[PDB]
Amino acid sequence: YPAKPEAPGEDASPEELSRYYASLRHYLNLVTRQRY
Secondary structure, eight states, X not given: OOOSXXXXXXXXXXXXXXXXXXXXXXXXXXXXXXXX
């Protein structure tokens, strides 16, 4: 459930939304490895 992170930082639920971050994270992953 969308309840646990009771603090100011990031308040968003996964499913379709985190699909943007997780997908964009993929490219950013093989791009970071080059200089990680």
